[model samples]
Target: KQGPTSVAYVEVNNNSMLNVGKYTLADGGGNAFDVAVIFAANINYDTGTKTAYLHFNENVQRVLDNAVTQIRPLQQQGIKVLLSVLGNHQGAGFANFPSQQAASAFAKQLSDAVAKYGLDGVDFDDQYAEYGNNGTAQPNDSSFVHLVTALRANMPDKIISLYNIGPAASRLSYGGVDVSDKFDYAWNPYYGTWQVPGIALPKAQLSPAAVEIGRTSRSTVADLARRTVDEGYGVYLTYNLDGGDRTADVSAFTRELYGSEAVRT
Candidate 1:
């Protein structure tokens, strides 16, 4: 019955040769990760052929398959696993599904993949939900929700996570879903600004959907964790183990957020 006092999301790219579970969560000692949203399961739709695929290419497929193996340890430690699906700016490939039927099909394919891989759930990286690379505004709320609904139908208990990506005109700039109730947790990336801003979600949006701030480094771990408790917002950090000697940083991050047991108790 333990939960993180502050949540951390470490997204690992699917192309990495290293076992992310070992490096991201089990490194040094261990990190208090409530959810590990695996970097990407890129969506592909062939231009020549009218088809949409969730698994993407060979390397991506391999990484995803290996993810099933690497995730065992994290899961044993009670860390939830989720796979993220991203789209290019053009929204040509996986972003622009032809129709509602196509979206449903993609959702079904994605839901099946989640079940087949023994994953806890899925996350959508639809930054271009409103428009494609061509500057065309697409039907976001309905189409995207259609996809979310299908996935929920398949895994009723699974967590559905998304960025705070609402329309361009929205306040505070991170609310992803038009209807906040559709998702479990909604996060807004702070990028490199390093400051948590005022919350812009309504009571209906705030209660059912928890707001989170994701930064780009572990240097701000302590402050972020404290802020999570103080202001009541979740936090995620960018981590690239192979990028450098992060053992010390990782160790500190793990110990600070989890050592007290209060952080994730």
Candidate 2:
């Protein structure tokens, strides 16, 4: 069975696109990562219109535009490739969608991008928004609620996840459904901390710690992996994996979760 315990992000700007598929559980059950997130598409603001739009940087565009070459191989190994959406310091962000209609419009953009690029889903990270710079209102309770609700409506079949940070973390419910219900997974964004997102998701849908491979200590990595398994949590997230050989660093957790070392192919 494919373990739901491991997730990773690839910084496409500095890493080889194919590096995403290079690691797997040593037993060959599946890729080591249950989900691989492209380390971001920006939520940029249109100065003239005061609107939010999706912006894929050069590297992100390269991967999405050439998914057959850059993403298909990872999918073939049973990994779900997702596009991560975050802010571009443009006063627009996931948590500032003003109204349901505005949220829906942006949701459509994300849905269209997913459909057009054949991606598995979208991940939202609420950071670097700089929310009042262009006269955009500060985040309100209903903003994230509206955006995620509209997003779910736009693509009910695709996965939706949260990095569990910033204003969006607190603003998670709408129309009687908790944010935990709408999101497939939510993980702690602070590296080295053992804190869960402030939602009522089941342990299986929540990850309580995050780490950066090659940067986070091996002791901490093992502790988080052990915590996930021992505490019944279902996800362990790591970020900033590059093309370098860090099998030893990653295996520190994989061995705890999978009972086998991580093998980099």
Candidate 3:
């Protein structure tokens, strides 16, 4: 098998979209990062309409609207571009869709956005949606299951991932299908070593350690990479990458996983 897939989250609000394309595996295996995630788009509630909607801020919108210029370059280099959908401080969230139909509705919105923007996939992060507020249901077992099920139906070819945090983490299985069946990948949200239990996915599809580019220590990063390799895991996650030169920060881990340093393109 190829080395563990490298995933990075870039905060588009403060980072250049092109920064994702800067690193490559020095052994000529292609981009060092397998997936470049746009830090976030939001799940916002429309109080007047009594519904949840997908909302992209200026930075996220710019990248989607200008995919030819901003996104295609990354795709051209074999990197999959994904949009991370997070929750605003609204009542609606990934774990509280009043019913399966409501979950499907939101899934439609996500599907439409993925199709319209030509993104490789969507990443779901359960955070900040203060459930039970504004007449929304609290976290329920069916909500996340329904949403991802419908989403997979809507975009079978596209990638769907779970950040493995918040309420959705506990509410993973419903109607016999596990979240591991719906999502292509699931990763630990915290910055250190930890595994997301109960998904039953192959080690290749699960990431047990995550880091923030500038904040996580270099030694820890390398150790995590070594662990991934030794433990038969095939995914390593990193977040909060900025526009600055971070090659030094990631090189130790990249070498551990990919057998070479990460090179700037």
Q: What are the per-residue Cα lDDT tens digits for candidate 2 across 78-156?
A: 7788889998899998878888888888889999999999998999999999888788888887778888888898799
Model 2, runs deviating above 4 Å:
174-177
Using TM-score as the measure, name the better of candidate 1 and candidate 3.
3
Q: Candidate 1, TM-score vs. the true structure?
A: 0.68
Where does the lowest 10-residue lDDT sum fall in candidate 1?
Answer: 203-212
lDDT of 1 by residue, 112-207 (tens): 878887788877665543344344334343556556656677778787766544331122112354434446655544443343322344322221
Model 3 pairs whose backbones collide:
none
Tell me how far the alpha carbon of residue 141 in candidate 1 is from the true structure, in angstroms, after superposition.
3.9
Could you tell me the lDDT of residue 149 within candidate 1?
A: 58
lDDT of 3 by residue, 46-108 (tens): 888888988999999988888898789989888899999998998889998878888899999
Give me the overall lDDT of model 1.
Answer: 0.50
Ranking of candidates on TM-score, top first: 2, 3, 1
RMSD of each: 6.3, 1.4, 1.5
TM-scores across all candidates?
0.68, 0.96, 0.95
